Amino acid sequence: QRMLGFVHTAQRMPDKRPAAERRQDFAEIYARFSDERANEQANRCSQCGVPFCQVHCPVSNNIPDWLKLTSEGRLEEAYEVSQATNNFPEICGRICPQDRLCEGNCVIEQSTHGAVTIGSVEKYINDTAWDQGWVKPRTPSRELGLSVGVIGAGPAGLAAAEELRAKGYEVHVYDRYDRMGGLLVYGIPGFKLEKSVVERRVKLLADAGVIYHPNFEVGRDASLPELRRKHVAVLVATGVYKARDIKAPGSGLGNIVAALDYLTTSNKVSLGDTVEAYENGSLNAAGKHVVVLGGGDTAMDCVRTAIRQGATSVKCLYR
């Protein structure tokens, strides 16, 4: 079992490592659940009728069902029922803001009782099923006579390509950069998302049979009418890349670098390509006074990467 024990328990997140111990590395902050704490935290759900947890999650997960499952053993069924409506549960459980999407509207949350560790247990139930190969490539039985194209390796493109390969079509991707995955491999950090899991996901999606095209710009290597002539339907997943600026005196000096360039170069030097703009340039933060402009999780990532890469002094302002 009876999973209504939220009256005599206390909300406890998984094991987190302290602040100083992370000020020097690139590993993640949160650790994987132990079996005992995970099994306990899965009981606190209330099986609430009209669950306010689902009505807020964007992909509309069947949260209570796999919650009950993971609380009643048999993680397999939980994994399949969670994968049935989501293609990348690890990304969602690691990055999606629970304070406004999942853990911000739980029914017990509105009574100062604190929500349940939905996102982290989501990540867990996804990852713990990877030890025995419970994840399987969604390849079709029979081949269907149609080819389809998608531009951009972002999350939308990846999910649409996987769904089209599940249908029976022939999918081709197009990315401007080499290591595909959209901003999931160059924009977001490595301490937030260890690139190992993203690479495992890319390998699983490639194993279905979809052909990939690394380092292919649609503008110069082809044209939109040419794509319409080759493939019957190209799906646009370019996202957004043109940044803004500020028009005021003082922007005529050097050392003005936007967030995307520094973040991409940091992710690269984390993975490779040995970009020279970091060492043989002013993109480094050895001991300088690196200040950032603007706000949000973007500037948050900027200052966090800064305090990771030396930067004895870092500041951040917001209007």
Binding site: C48, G49, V50, P51, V55, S60, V107, S141
Partner: protein, 1472 residues
Amino acid sequence: CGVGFIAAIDGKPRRSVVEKGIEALKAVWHRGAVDADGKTGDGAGIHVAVPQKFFKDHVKVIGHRAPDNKLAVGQVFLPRISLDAQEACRCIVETEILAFGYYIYGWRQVPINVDIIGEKANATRPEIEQIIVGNNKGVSDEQFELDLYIIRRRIEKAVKGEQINDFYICSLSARSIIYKGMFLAEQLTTFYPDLLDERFESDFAIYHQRYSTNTFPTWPLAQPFRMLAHNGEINTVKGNVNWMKAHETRMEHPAFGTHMQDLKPVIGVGLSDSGSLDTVFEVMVRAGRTAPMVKMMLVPQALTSSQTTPDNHKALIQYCNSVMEPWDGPAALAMTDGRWVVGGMDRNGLRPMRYTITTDGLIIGGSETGMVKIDETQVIEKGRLGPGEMIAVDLQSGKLYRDRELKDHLATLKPWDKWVQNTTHLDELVKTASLKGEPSDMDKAELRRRQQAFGLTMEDMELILHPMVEDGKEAIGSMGDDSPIAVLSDKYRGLHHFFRQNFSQVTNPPIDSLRERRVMSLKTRLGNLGNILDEDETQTRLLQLESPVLTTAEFRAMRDYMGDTAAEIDATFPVDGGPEALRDALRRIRQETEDAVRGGATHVILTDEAMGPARAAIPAILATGAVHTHLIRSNLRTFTSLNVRTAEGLDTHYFAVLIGVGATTVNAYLAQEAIAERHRRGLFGSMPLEKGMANYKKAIDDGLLKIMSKMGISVISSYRGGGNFEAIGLSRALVAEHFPAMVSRISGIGLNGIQKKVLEQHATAYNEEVVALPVGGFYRFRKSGDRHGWEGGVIHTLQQAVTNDSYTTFKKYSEQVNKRPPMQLRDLLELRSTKAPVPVDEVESITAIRKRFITPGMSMGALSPEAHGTLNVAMNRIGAKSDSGEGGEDPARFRPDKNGDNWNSAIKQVASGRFGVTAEYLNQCRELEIKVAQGAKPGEGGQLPGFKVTEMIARLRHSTPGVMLISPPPHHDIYSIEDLAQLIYDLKQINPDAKVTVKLVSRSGIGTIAAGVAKANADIILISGNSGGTGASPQTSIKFAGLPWEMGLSEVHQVLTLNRLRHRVRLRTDGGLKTGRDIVIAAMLGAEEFGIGTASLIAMGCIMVRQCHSNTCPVGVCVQDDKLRQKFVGTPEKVVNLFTFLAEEVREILAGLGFRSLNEVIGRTDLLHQVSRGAEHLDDLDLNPRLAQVDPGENARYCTLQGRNEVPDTLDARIVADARPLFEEGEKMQLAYNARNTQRAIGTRLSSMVTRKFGMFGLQPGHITIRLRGTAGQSLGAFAVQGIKLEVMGDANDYVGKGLSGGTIVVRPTTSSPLETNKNTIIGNTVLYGATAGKLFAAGQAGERFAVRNSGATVVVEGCGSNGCEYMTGGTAVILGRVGDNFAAGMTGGMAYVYDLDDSLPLYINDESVIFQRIEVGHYESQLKHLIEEHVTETQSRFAAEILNDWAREVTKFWQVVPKEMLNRLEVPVHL
């Protein structure tokens, strides 16, 4: 109402018989329905033997000669209006009486006086005449009777053939005669001066006066009927007519011969239940059986599963149960063959029946004791009647017969003990089944595909499938349902979802299913349907099954046993048949079965295993309906049987609705395979498959018993094919043709949409590659689920709007609610006025409209006291009316605190439990309430979990903490309409200030009950719906009970307008009222006041978690633990703002409509117009059968009377005029009076005066006392306060001490009566109902259901009957005599001190929750000694004095009964 019979033992005619009969009839005016006109009645009848000498003298006066043999008079009602029909009727009767050889003596017009009957009853008065005939062929008397009966039936048929209506025959025989009419039961001897002559002297006499529901009288519907009387109503009459049609063709007897063919349609047309019972009884008795045998066969004694009766009677009862299907229902029968006279009761003994023997060889019996005046010293025995008993008088030799002797004489006539063992059971075949034949269970993929073929989602297989196999019972819900109806839905809904179960309001009392399980059965009989009039051994050769549902192994065993006579039928139809493949398949099956049954097959086994990718499964329900109805209309169902295998039934509702169609057995082979695959996956743990299957079978049995008791039936043999269901959304033709008799108020989809949905689901299941079951939402909301009512956005918008106190946000909320697709009925109409819009500055005030809405009751047990008090004060702050509901209420909240807010409620309820009902509790309100049947879960009592009863709620409900409180579904006080009238009179007597209201739930034909209660002086009727909330109930009850309040309310309005009764009673609706539009619609339909309910709770902070049944509501509303209570955020300002906004919205919509005040719109049904959904659904719901109306005339469309409806006053009023010093200076008094039986509820208005002057415990015991002489009326001493002592000399009628509250009542016979005290009954049934404080001392035997629901009172009696101390909760009872069977059913508090000599207690006790032992502790010894001392020094019984005398050796004969859960709470350890 009333029924009674008088008889002489020897059989010599005497005028005193009819004299006492008429006299006793003249005193049945207190149970009637006195109206304003005072002249019109509702039917009264008397029945005597033929006064031969009078008619002989008359015919000698005419000029003929009186023959030696006896004469025969035929009394008839002939048409009066047109002179063209009377000639035809005379012609017909003469032609058919002279065609056999008898001699007509002439006609005679009985003198009558039409001056006393009213006008409305006179407009349909027929002409009464009589003919005289005489046996002249010299034939015997029995042949004379048979021939006259056949002639009468032939005349009736021949005159029915000519459509010449308005003709009736009272009775045509040479032994009996009947004087009946629609006059008032008091002035009979004035309407019929014939009974005033000194020659009408008979050996027996029957008298009856009925209580009719409606108001339009029809003369031929007055009792007694031909050779029978009756009281009450028979529940199972729908299936009885069908089984009679089945039995019609397989009966014959040489006593009738050729004319037998003339008696094929045995049951006529246009009669009540007693009429059909009477016709069947007559046509059965005319074959050779006596009266007692026919009574034992028709209404059999409840077959107890014990050894309390010699086995010969058991064999006889088994034979009678096998030969004829029983007839349940509350009934007190007084049947009179020309030789015997038998008075008996039904299976359960729901109505009272008491008889007295004089010392002059004269027996009298009836429903009361002091109707006919008897001397006190000429009484030989005062006796009563229990369940199944029967007392008989034989005039052929002048001999009386009590129960045991009569039944022994009966069972003497045939060797019953040798005919029972000819049959066999099933367990014998099961035990010899070889351990072989294991069918390979289908693969998981196959099972999942077949389940998707019927949309059986996964939440079903774990919400209401796991507990049924694990725990051993059904699931539990926590709130009303907000899913749309089965027709407005979008997903594939099973066909069973279109069937709503039935129940019974005050017209028929439901029966509990947790205590009286001994009186119910589920036996099925294969190979028994056959002859009914003959007697041989060809009726005791059959097979008997204990349960109508079967597993797979037992079903295969039965199929292997049946051999080479079982014909299988494929219930699959090719999906590619065409647009009308379903009709072709149904025609094919309904022809193929009729083909096979004649070829030599005696069994039809309908199967559907042939389902494949090209052939879909025909709905088993529809196929069974068509096949059974064709076998019924083809005179073949008797020849065979019907066993069905399903693939779509999983819950208890499906088996019930399928049996209710006409099938014999039902087998589900999918559920067993799913259970096996779930067990082998190691989900239940370590529970083997056998134990799980056994628990599943037990749960299904419990479910069938509950659903069968929800209506008032006792045995499945009469419910099979009874068609006790309501259909919504089906076409008129389909239901009226394929189903036997089911009323469909609105025509619906035919066979197109059904086949369309079925084929679409089959395609989406089999044609595609599915691997996992869909989640689905039917019991709890989901994103991929259908449209529920309370949506998350809706709740959040309403909460933000009520917190911010913003009108624009509330308007946006209302718009969001209105902009949804159709969900309920009120989404299919549209307002349409014709006048010019009126500016909003001209409609009435906001408070004047706010004073209408109320908030329904909420039990203190289900809710937390905080929200209770918050809602209470929020409603009392503005001036509107609030509610309190059951569960009582704290007394400390009777007066306001210093802050100026009153926590007291404005309305108190009277449920079936009567927990907090004391004297003080019923005088602090301005409105009473009766909880006849709850809305969300009708046919059931208030439930509450075991660990929710804390100290506070237990001290409030007067119960032992830590028990699962289940209030009895029956009411134990409303068994018919007159009992409801009595309770209404009691409630209006105890409180001379307020009114009393009755609650109902919508269903078909509720208008009759409405017009019935309207004659009971009730003034407010609350019609609930089927979408209301509750604390805890089974989901099958929530989703499958009732109808939306639209039809119910719109029909009650029509009916109450049709009988000029609308202008006397108010009307208030509730259930699913959310925004202003629905309020205006409900007011348009004819309502005055309204409710809010769950909506208001959403403003309080309810988040619809639907976990209130676990005492773990996170927001802290339905909680009884101190931890969650401190999370409350409730605030009355929220409710004030909510009501203000609702009133503003209603004002605005009314102003925009075109009127000025609500009181000018009620009843205007023409202001609405139905709008279609379009052509996207092709459904044909026409709501016109609700928009109809009848012109009112001169009175108003609303209630136009201020103040309550006054009722007459009893003797106690004159008592108040004498007790001045007690209410001026407070001095002791001592009064004496001669009280009669026609004075009801003596000692209640005085109790009200006392409790308003002083209180409850403000006086010393025995302050004022009243000595009544002669027998007393009904409801003696109801709600007596401490200080009053009512000493009555004689005997009480009924319901003595109902709700005792500290007083003291004593009953003792007249000291000059030569009666042994402990060998006579002195009180009626239902003693000390709802007692909480006081002492009762009797001097005789007690009735039935003794001291039920006692709380803190003490009682001493000298005997009891069945169901003694049922569901007792606390107090002390000492019985000195013979306790009945099934004693202390569900006793969870108190004690019982029984005195039995023959060690018969271990045979009658209900050893479930109590233990019985010897006396061991000296403390209880002294307590019992002092109790007996108080008894003997109070009433002075000889038996008690003798017991007190020899004390050394009698305590070792006394036994002690103590509840189980109270061993660890007694300060005195009962053990050593």
